[PDB]
Symmetry: C4
């Protein structure tokens, strides 16, 4: 039977640890993939950790230059959540240097975007096997979520991006059924910039918090019905949640325009909670260090700065990076609502550390009905390694 994602998001007060794989501590000795862009998505029965291997292993010469973004050695693979991307537990999913994946109830669907920058191709897999394709429509680095896609009653939805990195690109939504694409929509976002959308089910529609790599230090927001009529804009909250951003007092919020004049960005997430919003952001406003998630009273619908709850997952002396969203299916949590959950990627090595390589580990969190104490579940690996 097709899996339900009609339900409302559980209003949550705090987040509790789901997992931590220790891939890089472990990788010092064990056989673990050099990766980046880890993410999570769940089936009726398990939660899995997708990721992009650099086609090589930690502590090996082949991990040299693994800070590069797009190589033909790049693949998408998966493991049981909390397990490290070690060679002997990773399932093959797709060739990809940009990806997304989710479950419709019956099988896994995955999108693998590889190829030359001018002409990338996204290969849709369903049941492990290629089913459909989208070729680059704008000829400049076709790319997508790097976090779980979404499936609401058998049909799956996700967001991609083609175009320049620091100017107006173009944003499309896609809809498929059993690995087969059955619809699409071009997003009208003049003067806006949408990348790496962290989405989730909610009230029967798809809500994504995405990244502005142009000017905004606030995050684009895209709310998608199944008929593909969307509504697009930014996270109302008067608090900047990109990185880099400016200070909180020094920020004016907007549900409509992008705000701040800092370039660049980082992947991040938000969860609408009725009217409030849980937002994640690296602690450091400049560097990809630390992590913390804030509940803001009415920060989704209104430009509020009212932080009702704060919690720290990675402290500021520790590295982090990307973070994103996914939900536990009702068939997994037994809850009458879709538990909000997230994960943080924790990058180590180059460019900041004295290694020939770049990789990352993760900690997954999940929404419980109480406040959880602050702590720092960091990567915790000693650098350099021996290959360095």
């Amino acid at each position: 039977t097709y899996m339900n994602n009609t339900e409302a998001i559980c209003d949550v007060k705090g987040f509790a640890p789901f997992s931590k794989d220790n891939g890089i501590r472990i990788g010092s000795r064990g056989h673990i993939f050099v990766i980046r862009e880890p993410f999570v998505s769940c089936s009726p029965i398990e939660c899995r950790t997708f990721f992009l291997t650099q086609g090589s292993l930690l502590n090996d010469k082949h991990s040299n230059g693994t800070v590069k973004d797009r190589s033909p050695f790049r693949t998408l693979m998966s493991v049981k959540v909390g397990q490290s991307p070690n060679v002997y537990q990773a399932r093959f999913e797709a060739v990809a240097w940009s990806a997304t994946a989710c479950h419709d109830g019956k099988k896994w669907m995955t999108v693998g975007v590889t190829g030359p920058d001018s002409k990338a191709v996204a290969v849709i897999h369903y049941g492990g096997v290629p089913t459909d394709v989208i070729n680059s429509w704008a000829g400049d680095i076709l790319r997508t979520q790097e976090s779980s896609c979404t499936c609401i009653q058998g049909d799956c939805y996700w967001v991609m991006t083609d175009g320049p990195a620091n100017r107006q690109a173009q944003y499309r939504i896609y809809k498929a059924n059993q690995g087969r694409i059955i619809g699409q929509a071009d997003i009208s976002f003049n003067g806006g910039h949408i990348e790496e959308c962290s989405c989730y089910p909610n009230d029967g529609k798809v809500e994504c918090v995405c990244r502005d790599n142009w000017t905004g230090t606030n995050r684009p927001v895209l709310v998608i019905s199944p008929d593909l009529s969307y509504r697009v804009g930014y996270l109302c909250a008067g608090i900047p949640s990109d990185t880099p951003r400016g200070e909180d007092a020094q920020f004016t919020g907007s549900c409509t325009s992008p705000m701040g004049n800092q370039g660049y960005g980082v992947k991040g997430f938000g969860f609408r909670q009725g009217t409030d919003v849980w937002m994640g952001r690296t602690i450091s406003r400049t560097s990809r260090s630390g992590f913390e998630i804030l509940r803001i009273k009415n920060g989704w619908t209104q430009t509020s700065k009212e932080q009702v709850r704060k919690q720290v997952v990675v402290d500021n002396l520790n590295w982090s990076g990307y973070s994103g969203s996914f939900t536990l299916p009702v068939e997994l949590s037994g809850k009458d609502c879709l538990v909000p959950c997230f994960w943080v990627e924790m990058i180590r090595g180059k460019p900041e550390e004295k290694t020939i390589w770049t990789s990352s580990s993760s900690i997954v969190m999940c929404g419980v009905d109480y406040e959880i104490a602050d702590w720092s579940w960091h990567d915790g690996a000693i650098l350099p390694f021996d290959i360095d």
Copy 2:
């Protein structure tokens, strides 16, 4: 269908080897987790070995300082009983530096206690996924069994501890249904001290033999009905089974007060056999070396010192440590009673041995209807390793 644990414990005469993983011999070369606190628990169809990784691997720099108790790299994982905690066979269970886990018939439930000492959080998993939480109630190192919890007809029960290590702490019982907590009880044990309870089903109620880290060299006993009305005290037996303890002749037994004035303690187990009790204790009365289990005529209900049976599992020139309890479900043994079984952890390295690390291996035993010869199935690994 929900699994039965109504049954009576098989009166057993001796214990026969269930398994031995050789993790540290194997770990010299293979990829095995640095761990401690191994334990066992069974499903309708398999027996599994839970454990706490130090988020690192044997023979690796990251195994340095792995004598520490609570790090954020700490996780709970599982394998098939007798298999070593190697990377590629370990399933992820929870983030934990203190834990317990069991099966209700339908899925696995696990409790993962991590966080800062002042404010620990216990994350209940069921079916791999977080379902409920308990925050530290006394602000000092929330902790639990480090041995299998217990599930009697679909509802699961276990014992935790918050408070100081060597004075009056506070002890709670918890009850849950499918990862969801549905009841609790505060244990009244003034002048008593309950830790690391080794429990099991018996006559339809939960019986635990726990650790006194305060003064007692005998072990607390807690007998728990499903309505959460308990009865608490010590193991009547006139023989001390903690470590360190004093000699046997130099010991007065009590079902009520703690006895001996030695501090400290170690995790251990007991099995009520009608009126008698099987008790495990490290051979050495001072050091964590050797192991042996004694049947005492009427040592559960009365303060007897009558050893009807003795058996040695690890000899005194060999290291050991923690030991605990679990049962084979009727759906596994075919017996009309719940076979008593136990395991012994065998610690090696720091603090006693010339290594940068600390870890342990295990041998599981099980109740058969005959006396079994003495022997010593020790860890048997050659120290130091190369990383040392």
Copy 3:
């Protein structure tokens, strides 16, 4: 139920990446088999990568002299497609230094040809276990496809070769039911030479594109009905697709005779598309470097040189080698036709590279309904390794 392969081949316009295992990059450090002759074949539910281990591992002394073709250490094993032939994921299939394997709907059948050259023996497995045998009939290196066999409604068909390497050998077809051989046919190909046939289902019959190691620089073609009455000849196309071959202008095509007077050859594939043919060939006309696949208007039935479509999978500065065919069962693709798919093997080391060993990696491709951009998904491993 027995699996269908009655259907027609999907007319495809371009091919999109199915997988890439990175075995040799990975093998630098991880535990991967030294292999050659990888290939693919699918079940109702998964696609698997068969291969021939050299009974040893990459970066190990035992990988010395692994350029040899036939050793008693040679075995056939399998993994999930896209996974590398690593020790801990490889299933055992058969002892073989030449092989083929496929699925009939119920279980896997595999043929393992090992033994001395003068008297080889092919062991048919079905369900993992030996079921039937064929002894060498001509006493000179009994051998077969090194690419998936074919199963059409419960009965499986494949092609073997006994005899000299560079003169008239002898070619047989075999037919079996559940690992049991129920028919055979001697192919009459005087002055022709058939080896390493790359086959697939199509319209209810078996079509193979094979290798001419005698004189032809075009490829033998064998079309096989289930009654074992075949029709044999060469690929009409006026373009040479063996290696080595001569130039395209300097080639006269023939559906009947072999063409070119270059000896040797390499394994390769073709897909009939109604009247046109997709053909693969290494880019370099002399060396086993690069790869590319061309659709030729009416090149199957007529001696045409009309290339309607071109696509490059491995560029000419990169190594490749063998390539072959297989299809995705309708029960896997949901398509009303059997998606054509192929894979390319990418050899590295000896004889061309400064290593003591020889091995290879793979990229699998699959037929989609659009043109896919050119690129080069090469092996990408840095040579020599440390063992060298």
Copy 4:
């Protein structure tokens, strides 16, 4: 449903390769157990390779002194047939320095004999979990088959030995149901010596070819009905099949007395074929080198030396050792008879080779309806290793 082994043994003409694991070639680099006594046994759906680890790994210091026979680090584990005993694929079966295992149709039963020599204990497992026990009855190295036991319609039968190694010991038969022992029989063999019985189903009864470590250079034979009334003696064949033995001409055969006055022995097998017998023996009459199997016309019932068929599996310049029996269940081969199959162990290292360790690999064979060419599928590993 309980599995059938009523059937007759397929009269076979030759044996064809089932598998070869290459454990020691592979072990040079990969993580493989140091072992001995490998053996095979099949379930309705798979064939598995049991073995005795030395609780350590190849190329590791802990493999020192692994020529010893009985250590407490010794365990029994299993893998899919043809797979090597690598850490990450081995299932745990039992603690054992002597063993046997088989399948009754529903679950696996295994016997694990460990402990001190004077008082060994055999732990019966069924479904992975300990179910029954037999204590040493004669106080001198309780031991058993080291090759598959036998299960005929739900009840399982096997043979053990207690007593001295080179004089009269004592031999018992055991019968169990679902890991539970329901019968036993003392074998009357005055002046005879039965060890390491290689058994199999045949006509509804159990037939074993065992080892005489006393005086016989011919092999004891024990034919066992399910009521436990046996008939015991030696293999009639006038050809010696132990090792060491004397020449063939210099041998008088006896179905009754032991023959030859050479001490010692090695494990080996025989298959009754109507009246004839397939017998295996190492080629060298003195050393454990080479292997070959001979069909002898009427060598089971009469003292014949008529070799109708010969076949060589390992040549005489290559090491071998133990060999034993098992059958493919009808539910696996589809044959109306139980295909005879065997395996040969191939020992390497100490005492004969320049290594600190001793271990072995295997090749499994199986009965097909034709003669198979001679060859030598030897271990093929280069010695010493690096640890040496």
